[PDB]
Amino acid sequence: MAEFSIIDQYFNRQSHPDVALGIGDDSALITPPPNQQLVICADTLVAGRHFPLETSPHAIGWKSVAVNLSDIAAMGAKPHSILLAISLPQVDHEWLEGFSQGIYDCCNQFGVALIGGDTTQGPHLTITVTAMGWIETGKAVLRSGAKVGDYVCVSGQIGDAAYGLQHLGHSLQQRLDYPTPRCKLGEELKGLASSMIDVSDGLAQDLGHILKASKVGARLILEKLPVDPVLQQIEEQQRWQYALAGGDDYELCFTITPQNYEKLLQKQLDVKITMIGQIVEQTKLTFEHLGSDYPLQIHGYQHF
Amino acid sequence: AEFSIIDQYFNRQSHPDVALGIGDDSALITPPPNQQLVICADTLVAGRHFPLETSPHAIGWKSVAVNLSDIAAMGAKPHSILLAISLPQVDHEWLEGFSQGIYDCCNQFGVALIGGDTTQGPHLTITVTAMGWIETGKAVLRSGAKVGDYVCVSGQIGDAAYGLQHLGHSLQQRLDYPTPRCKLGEELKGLASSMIDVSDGLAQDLGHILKASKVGARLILEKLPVDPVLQQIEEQQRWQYALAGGDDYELCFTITPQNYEKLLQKQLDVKITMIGQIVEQTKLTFEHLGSDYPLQIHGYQHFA
Ligand SMILES: Nc1ncnc2c1ncn2[C@@H]1O[C@H](COP(=O)(O)OP(=O)(O)O)[C@@H](O)[C@H]1O
Ligand SMILES: Nc1ncnc2c1ncn2[C@@H]1O[C@H](COP(=O)(O)OP(=O)(O)O)[C@@H](O)[C@H]1O
Ligand SMILES: Cc1ncc(C[n+]2csc(CCOP(=O)(O)OP(=O)(O)O)c2C)c(N)n1
Ligand SMILES: Cc1ncc(C[n+]2csc(CCOP(=O)(O)OP(=O)(O)O)c2C)c(N)n1
Ligand SMILES: [Mg+2]
Ligand SMILES: [Mg+2]
Ligand SMILES: [Mg+2]
Ligand SMILES: [Mg+2]
Ligand SMILES: [Mg+2]
Ligand SMILES: [Mg+2]
Ligand SMILES: [Mg+2]
Ligand SMILES: [Mg+2]
Ligand code: NA
Ligand code: NA
Ligand code: NA
Ligand code: NA
């Protein structure tokens, strides 16, 4: 079984009616919805670096899609379709069946179509997914735009996936293996959030991209960070390391005025929202604990 | 480090046809009116899609070229690319040459680099996503070939496959620096009845058209456009390079006699050769000096 049978056997379910031309030709074709901009991103997952080597093939496929839908959500946009480029050393039916199942389970959960890609042989498992979304023209939430006085907020919990990586077997491994892209929240933040980013590297480092892009600073309250009860029971130091520098969260961190935060809380959401601090004028990220300044040194995930 | 790599090598101005380029979670494109998005992605694996010692400039060039080739194969105009690279080491001399190759190909064809992803991985792997636009409904597909249509191919075929086995020969330039036939693809909109780019080998790639169109073809072996160097080698090897070599990135297309006459009236920037015609019998056969010529051909396939 070779390249072309592989595509047909695992990556060629019937295309959505809303896709002008799916898998089968030199490119895919999409008809843009009217009065909307294309939103596009791509992220690579390297075996043994973005996930443990023994990660289940289903989880590998899920996360490959999930982390890229998360980057669409971080813009306020609605995801539409993906391309899948996979390089793998060996043809393993069992692995490919479970991997394609994770691809399609994530796509199906968020209404996304798989419309093309590329399948190659290479010595190390390497997956690049390109994601495409659409957004009302002009309405994208940027990493710039945060203003002094805006609240700093984050969805869900932070630190779960990082704790899980260090405690494989623990229930919190599910947050490492199966992050949830906050797609509907991202769309609900269109027109409310003044800036936004998804927490892939670590909350402090990813907030920092907003602070640099907006030429502002932020003061965070450590005891308001939303952590899992398990992390609430570990020592404070390691708890805040996990929460602020763990990464792999794929939650949304955003800024928002107090008035728009009240409108956001009136909405029906599928995820917890926590206000964790405020944007300030001084161009520094600082931490507060029990009403006093808390010095804290911290580094997020960077390749190389 | 990762963030310095992007800023130093992959962050040239955006440019004008791009609402939001590099620096956010996704890129933003305002679609031109009355046009469909054309999108594709191809992966290059070091030591497999190019000799390990290929210059970084040629690696960058080809990474873009092979993807513009799949846009050209639809009759579409290329617009922008994303670049996903997994690198074992940070090498500034390599990165300078590679990024220069990326941009030299983009600049030659009016294409913007609007985003991507940079990761560490044990083996050099590059996936470019290419985006183009086509007047709605006017894409040239792999289906559509009709009995009586001529089979044509641009340029020369076999050059790159010869160069790969004769590294150091002048024809290595066609391996290292294929030319995507962008303008020709555009000029075949409304003229070609079907089209594919010849990445795997003319016989196999024409085979994809034959299967999608439910027709066959008869090719005239002495009409195949080969380099003078291949004209001087034994004819069996000549035909294997020409028909199963791959890596040509020429356009193979079908066209009515009537529309072929119109194509010739255009001032084209590449040679065009009529090499045979579509027939009812659903087989690819070869003819040489007026008689059937049996030929066993196997084009490129991963895991084969
Ligand atoms: N893993 C994949 N998932 C989805 N579609 C894929 C995948 N690999 C390839 N494809 C699709 O299968 C078709 C054949 O792929 P390919 O032979 O690589 O095309 P080309 O030779 O034009 O680059 C294309 O339509 C491509 O987008
Ligand atoms: N090699 C590259 N070429 C072009 N753009 C790139 C490349 N690598 C990353 N980018 C861009 O740099 C920015 C930051 O990348 P990254 O930190 O990986 O984003 P994210 O964490 O949201 O996935 C993005 O805008 C991305 O599109
Ligand atoms: C085996 C293993 N080691 C380490 C990690 C942690 N990790 C890997 S990548 C990463 C950051 C997210 O990946 P990146 O490539 O930076 O994604 P992007 O910012 O492009 O979305 C983290 C915290 C992991 N998930 N698995
Ligand atoms: C070192 C090396 N070995 C072999 C080849 C030949 N080769 C590699 S890939 C390929 C076909 C084109 O690659 P593929 O991944 O199938 O591209 P696609 O069809 O997706 O465009 C050929 C002929 C090469 N260029 N370099
Ligand atoms: Mg092609
Ligand atoms: Mg990224
Ligand atoms: Mg990302
Ligand atoms: Mg391909
Ligand atoms: Mg990152
Ligand atoms: Mg992001
Ligand atoms: Mg291709
Ligand atoms: Mg191929
Ligand atoms: Na990305
Ligand atoms: Na990444
Ligand atoms: Na492709
Ligand atoms: Na390929």
Author numbering:
A (entry chain B): 1 to 304
B (entry chain A): 2 to 305
Q: Could you give the paper's own sentences about this structure?
A:
Thiamine pyrophosphate (TPP) is the biologically active form of vitamin B1 (thiamine) and is essential for all living organisms. The same study also identified genes essential for growth on nutrient agar using high-density transposon mutagenesis, and found thiamine monophosphate kinase (ThiL) to be essential. In this study, we present high-resolution crystal structures of ThiL from the pathogen Acinetobacter baumannii (AbThiL) bound to substrate Thiamine monophosphate (TMP) and substrate analog adenylyl-imidodiphosphate (AMPPNP), and bound to its products TPP and adenosine diphosphate (ADP). The AbThiL structures assume the same two domain fold as MfThiL and AaThiLwith an N-terminal A domain and a C-terminal B domain.
Two crystal lattices were observed, an orthorhombic crystal form, and a monoclinic crystal form. Orthorhombic crystals were obtained from MCSG1 B1 (20% w/v PEG 4000, 600 mM NaCl, 100 mM MES/NaOH pH 6.5) and were harvested with reservoir with 20% v/v ethylene glycol, 5 mM ADP/TPP/MgCl2 added as cryo protectant. The orthorhombic crystal form was consistent for all complex structures and was refined for all ligands. For consistency, the orthorhombic ADP/TDP-bound structure will be used as the reference. The equivalent metal in the product complex is a magnesium ion as well, bridging between β-phosphate of TPP and β-phosphate in ADP and between α-phosphate and β-phosphate of ADP. In addition, we observed that the product complex (ADP/TPP) has a very similar conformation as the substrate complex. A superposition of the product complex and the substrate complex of AbThiL highlighs that the α-phosphate of TMP/TPP, and the α-phosphate and the β-phosphate groups of AMPPNP/ADP virtually do not move. Even the transferred phosphate group, the γ-phosphate in AMPPNP and the β-phosphate in TPP, barely changes position. The distance between the phosphorous atoms is only 1.0 Å.
